[PDB]
Paper text:
A subset of bovine antibodies contain an ultralong CDRH3 (1), where a cysteine rich mini-domain or ‘knob domain’ is presented on an anti-parallel β-strand or ‘stalk’, which may constitute the entirety of the paratope. We have previously shown that the knob domain can function independently of the antibody scaffold to create an autonomous fragment of just 4-6 kDa. From these immunisations, knob domains which bound to human and rodent albumins enabled engineering of chimeric bispecific Fab fragments, via grafting into the heavy chain variable region (VH) framework III loop of a TNFα neutralising humanised Fab. By this route, neutralisation of the canonical antigen (TNFα) was retained but extended pharmacokinetics in-vivo were achieved through albumin binding.
We selected a humanised Fab fragment, FabT, which binds and potently neutralises human TNFα as an acceptor scaffold. The unmodified FabT fragment bound TNF with a KD of 221 pM and did not bind either HSA or MSA (data not shown). To determine whether the CDR conformations of FabT-aHSA and FabT-aMSA align with those of FabT, attempts were made to crystallize all three proteins. Conditions for crystallization were identified for FabT and FabT-aHSA but not for FabT-aMSA. FabT crystallized in the space group P1 21 1 with three copies in the asymmetric unit. The structure was determined by molecular replacement using the coordinates of an unpublished in-house Fab.
Residue numbers in the entry:
A (entry chain B): 1 to 213
B (entry chain A): 1 to 222
The structure:
């Protein structure tokens, strides 16, 4: 089979940068090369075919070049909506085969998070578990420290974080931290607080509430 | 326009069988082949094979013949991917796709359908409100949401107001809890001035358990 090797596997760059991704085939594919763009959870979108022809709707900042075994995708001036994973595919011989993908991330300026906290719902508490959600919305860079404190005692082992994909328009992230306790453990304490440290904040931000209030 | 719509995914036990369907619309079905492609972390995108709907001739990636069979029903403008003897590592998103036109690459893709190969049982989620309060409202903006907890397998889909509310929505990637069940939250930011006149309903669908839940998220008095 024809093996397709893409490089790099991931890259990050700033708006306005010229970025290059390469695809090498294990044998000559005579310009029979396609490029696809895919956003997380979404379908692949055809970007380029015949190695250098842009598909309907694709902006002119994209270009494809190469011949023989070696091909390149170039974005001349990177834009926030280009955040995606890019895949090459040879269309020359069966079985059709794809490159492993290049994940493209955007670097940009600092944006401080907005911090929100949600006590457990009455609906959930009726069932014997308490989930407390701390939300950091639309911030940059991704790095952030979120600590839970219950009656001023630092917690460990009872929370999980999830971060969104980078936004296609402003290149920011959002992050959830969820503290999960049995209802019994929850009723042993009074003050529940999320403390957030981030580059865009001059000092740590604490969002807090009192159980039962 | 041209559209491919898949159905049939979900949970299957190791060694079991499952059939996906791909319904084609917007063109004469017999004018193009239907191809099947799968996507999983690690091996990435892999091409499984094609079928020519006019002749019912199917051609395969040899790697896949022992577990995958492609067929068509011209009367239904549909192609099918029949899976047999599945392994846990065959968990993947399966796509049907169509070439732009003869000999060209794939311009049209089905939405993708996750097939999860596991011995664990199906579990439908509980849906709890993340109600807006003084602790989630600042600067003219209020955040609110839905916590979707304790489901298996993936995926759940969340919409807001039956799809009419999309701006400002963040549906987080699911996390795996130590219980082996998944959880996620979906949040939205809206004007704080509007909480008394606008209605916000999260629509949660977990097809593997036939779970469909609508939860109205109402403000909390704190």
């Amino acid at each position: 089979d024809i093996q397709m090797t893409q490089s790099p596997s991931s890259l990050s760059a700033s708006v306005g940068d010229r970025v290059t991704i390469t695809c090498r085939a294990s044998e000559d594919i005579y310009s029979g090369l396609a490029w696809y763009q895919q956003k997380p959870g979404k379908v692949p979108k055809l970007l380029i075919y015949d190695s250098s022809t842009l598909h309907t709707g694709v902006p002119s900042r994209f270009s494809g070049t190469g011949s023989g075994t070696d091909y390149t995708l170039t974005i001349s001036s990177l834009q926030p909506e280009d955040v995606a994973t890019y895949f090459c595919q040879q269309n020359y011989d069966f079985p059709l085969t794809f490159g492993q993908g290049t994940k493209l991330e955007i670097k940009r300026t600092v944006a401080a998070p907005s911090v929100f906290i949600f006590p457990p719902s009455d609906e959930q508490l009726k069932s014997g578990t308490a989930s407390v959600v701390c939300l950091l919305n639309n911030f940059y860079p991704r790095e952030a420290k979120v600590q839970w404190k219950v009656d001023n005692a630092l917690q460990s082992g009872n929370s999980q974080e999830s971060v969104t994909e980078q936004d296609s328009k402003d290149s920011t992230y959002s992050l959830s931290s969820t503290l999960t306790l049995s209802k019994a453990d929850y009723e042993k304490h009074k003050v529940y607080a999320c403390e957030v440290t981030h580059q865009g904040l001059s000092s740590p931000v604490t969002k807090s509430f009192n159980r039962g209030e | 326009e041209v559209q491919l719509v898949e159905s049939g995914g979900g949970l299957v036990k190791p060694g079991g069988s499952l059939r996906l369907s791909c319904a084609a619309s917007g063109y004469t079905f017999t004018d193009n082949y239907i191809h099947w492609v799968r996507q999983a972390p690690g091996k990435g995108l892999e091409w499984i094979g094609y079928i020519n709907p006019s002749s019912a001739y199917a051609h395969y990636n040899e790697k896949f013949k022992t577990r995958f069979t492609i067929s068509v029903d011209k009367a239904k403008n549909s192609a099918y991917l029949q899976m047999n003897s599945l392994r846990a590592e065959d968990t993947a998103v399966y796509y049907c796709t169509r070439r732009y036109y003869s000999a060209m690459p794939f311009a049209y893709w089905g939405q993708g359908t996750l097939v999860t190969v596991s011995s664990a049982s199906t579990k439908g989620p509980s849906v709890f409100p993340l109600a807006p309060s003084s602790k989630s409202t600042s600067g003219g903006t209020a955040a609110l949401g839905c916590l979707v907890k304790d489901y298996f397998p993936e995926p759940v889909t969340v919409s807001w107001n039956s799809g009419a509310l999309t701006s400002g929505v963040h549906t987080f990637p699911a996390v795996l809890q130590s219980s082996g069940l998944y959880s996620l939250s979906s949040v939205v930011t809206v004007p704080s001035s509007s909480l008394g006149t606008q209605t916000y309903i999260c629509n949660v669908n977990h097809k593997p358990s036939n779970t469909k839940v609508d939860k109205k998220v109402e403000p909390k008095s704190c």
